[PDB]
Design a binder for these strands. Structure first.
Ligand code: DCP
Ligand code: MG
Ligand code: MG
Length: 343
DNA sequence: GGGGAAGGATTC
DNA sequence: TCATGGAATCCTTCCCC
């Protein structure tokens, strides 16, 4: 057969805060990244469902949130803490399948093909899984089940929150036909608008255009991706993800183009980036700057060997110098990203 | 001879 | 200070050796 079971934790961060403070439950809760630039500068990382009903969701400014919802609990985000809960939950999942792809802090794919003989037993597995996370972590999750990762992902998107959905073989075929292509994982705002403009609305539409014409408009990779899902021939195996880069970006108190004013922030970011590397060694470093009008600009360097902390400090100042004498705009956010890990 | 670096798009 | 975090995947483009 080939059964994938996907698990996505409901309103994750905000839910961990309710579990930690069960008096929050049933009322609006908003998890915030406060940038420190003025009282309440920053964005919302997520909010529970009672906040979302009023428009308060992930990505908006805290300032927006607070004008639509004065009276909500606003909490700073403590990713560490959510990461500890996630790991315990990923270890429960591990118990239902050896073959598990941890996709992020709040979601994982299980290949349950050897555990379960059909979609009916998969569902029942969906449910002991749900009852088990609830019993052990007091966290509700949504489960999607289907023949591959993507449809398993779509199935969970359609059933959230606290849901479980199967998209069996006939349903795959219906969805390829009626599912708005904007709802396919990995297809964003810019790509969807490109596709509408050409009048491609459904996965099915992609089988009836010059592949070469699709590829032009959206890139070879997305074309191929969509077409393979539209042919029902998508079957990327469940695999261990290997982290490829680590980094840190911060917001300055104020916009500067002044190197001595910027460096305490760059060095702050190297030191936290280096600490999180823990034992792995990068051959590439990039300095990333977000300018006052929000363009992203970066300069990097790839060395034939690993970059020690001391080389990071001197390469990063140099790369900052290159940014500063290229672009004339002032800098609002500065950070560093290490990648191309040895071994 | 590509290849590497900068940016694009998406998602966390 | 004067909405627009932080983070990490591909992938694409385009310039120079
Ligand atoms: N712009 C964003 C979007 C999400 N997240 C974080 C907060 C979420 O708790 C977590 C997982 O994202 P989801 O899309 O799964 O959304 P939630 O889990 O919050 O809600 P739900 O899945 O219930 O829609 O990632 C973030 O930091 N920044
Ligand atoms: Mg998720
Ligand atoms: Mg979620």
């Amino acid at each position: 057969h080939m059964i994938v079971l996907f698990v996505d934790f409901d309103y994750f961060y905000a839910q961990v805060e309710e579990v930690l403070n069960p008096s929050l439950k049933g009322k609006p809760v908003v998890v915030c990244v406060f940038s420190g630039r003025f009282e309440d500068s920053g964005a919302v990382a997520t909010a529970n469902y009672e906040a979302r009903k009023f428009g308060v969701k992930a990505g908006i400014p805290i300032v927006e949130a607070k004008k639509i919802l004065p009276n909500a609990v606003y909490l700073p985000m403590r990713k560490e803490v959510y990461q500890q809960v996630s790991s315990r939950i990923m270890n429960l999942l591990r118990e239902y399948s050896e073959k598990i792809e941890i996709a992020s802090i709040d979601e994982a794919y299980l290949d349950i093909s050897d555990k379960v003989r059909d979609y009916r037993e998969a569902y029942n597995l969906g449910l002991e899984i749900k009852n088990k996370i609830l019993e052990k972590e007091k966290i509700t999750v949504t489960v999607g089940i289907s023949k591959n990762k993507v449809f398993a992902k779509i199935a969970a998107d359609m059933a959230k929150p606290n849901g479980i959905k199967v998209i069996d073989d006939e349903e795959v075929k219906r969805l390829i036909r009626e599912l708005d292509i904007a709802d396919v994982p990995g297809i964003g705002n810019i790509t969807a608008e490109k596709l509408k403009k050409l009048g491609i609305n459904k996965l099915v539409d992609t089988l009836s255009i010059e592949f070469d014409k699709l590829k032009g408009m959206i890139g070879e990779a997305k074309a191929k991706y969509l077409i393979s899902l539209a042919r029902d021939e998508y079957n990327e195996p469940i695999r261990t993800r290997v982290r490829k880069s680590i980094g840190r970006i911060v917001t300055m108190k104020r916009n500067s183009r002044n190197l001595e004013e910027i460096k305490p922030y760059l060095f702050r970011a190297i030191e936290e980036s280096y600490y999180k590397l823990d034992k792995r060694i990068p051959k590439a470093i990039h300095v990333v700057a977000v300018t006052e009008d929000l363009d992203i600009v970066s300069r990097g360097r790839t060395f034939p060997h690993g970059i020690s902390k001391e080389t990071a400090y001197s390469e990063s100042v140099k790369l900052l110098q290159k940014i500063l004498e290229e672009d004339e705009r002032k800098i609002r956010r500065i950070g560093v990203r290490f990648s191309k890990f040895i071994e």
